[PDB]
Scaffold this active site. Sequence first.
Site, mmCIF file in Angstrom:
data_model
loop_
_atom_site.group_PDB
_atom_site.id
_atom_site.type_symbol
_atom_site.label_atom_id
_atom_site.label_comp_id
_atom_site.label_asym_id
_atom_site.label_seq_id
_atom_site.Cartn_x
_atom_site.Cartn_y
_atom_site.Cartn_z
ATOM 1 N N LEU A 1 -8.973 3.685 3.081
ATOM 2 C CA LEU A 1 -9.971 4.305 2.194
ATOM 3 C C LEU A 1 -10.836 5.308 2.932
ATOM 4 O O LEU A 1 -11.340 5.004 3.993
ATOM 5 C CB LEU A 1 -10.855 3.226 1.531
ATOM 6 C CG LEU A 1 -12.044 3.828 0.814
ATOM 7 C CD1 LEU A 1 -11.569 4.568 -0.443
ATOM 8 C CD2 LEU A 1 -13.026 2.733 0.449
ATOM 9 N N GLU B 1 0.773 -1.231 0.000
ATOM 10 C CA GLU B 1 0.000 0.000 0.000
ATOM 11 C C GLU B 1 0.816 1.300 0.000
ATOM 12 O O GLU B 1 0.320 2.347 -0.405
ATOM 13 C CB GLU B 1 -0.933 -0.033 1.239
ATOM 14 C CG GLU B 1 -1.931 -1.188 1.158
ATOM 15 C CD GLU B 1 -3.058 -1.045 0.171
ATOM 16 O OE1 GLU B 1 -3.890 -1.919 -0.008
ATOM 17 O OE2 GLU B 1 -3.094 0.119 -0.440
ATOM 18 N N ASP C 1 -6.645 6.398 -4.768
ATOM 19 C CA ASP C 1 -6.083 5.082 -4.937
ATOM 20 C C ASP C 1 -6.110 4.635 -6.402
ATOM 21 O O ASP C 1 -6.375 5.426 -7.272
ATOM 22 C CB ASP C 1 -6.617 4.047 -3.936
ATOM 23 C CG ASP C 1 -8.051 3.674 -4.177
ATOM 24 O OD1 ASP C 1 -8.647 2.845 -3.553
ATOM 25 O OD2 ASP C 1 -8.583 4.292 -5.155
#
Length: 164
Positions: free
Chosen positions: A32, A11, A20
């Site tokens: 998120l 990530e 993203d």
Amino acid sequence: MNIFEMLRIDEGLRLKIYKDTEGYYTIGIGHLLTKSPSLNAAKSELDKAIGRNTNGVITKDEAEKLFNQDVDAAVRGILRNAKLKPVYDSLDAVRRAALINMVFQMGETGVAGFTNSLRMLQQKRWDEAAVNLAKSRWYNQTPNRAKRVITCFRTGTWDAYKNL
Ligand SMILES: [Cl-]
Ligand SMILES: [Cl-]
């Protein structure tokens, strides 16, 4: 190697709000914020998550705290999910980490939908599951990450993450 280190590699770490791979507002270590197309809605979720007026920027510590929560939640989501739990219980440590990774990325619902791959993992048919996992939007949209996770299912080792 462990789940935290694994996900940190997959990530990355960003301290300012960003988009993203799907164009969704995110921050920190793949946390998120919202799927809404508004930066303001994203700023609002952020402040609510951190407990302060952020202005879209957080500290490293803050990022790590969201990460801790997110991993915890992924694990708990797996254990509470009727389809996921039995798979998870059947796997070894490395492979469990791979399943957590997929859940962290796509949510419990999304993973629970890989019905056939799950059945194969449970049966320990590694090569067959790896081929089935690859026949997905997930693999076609984020191939390098998917390849790494899949290698873990295939080999039961962290080889794909060593170097990174
Ligand atoms: Cl939160
Ligand atoms: Cl990728």
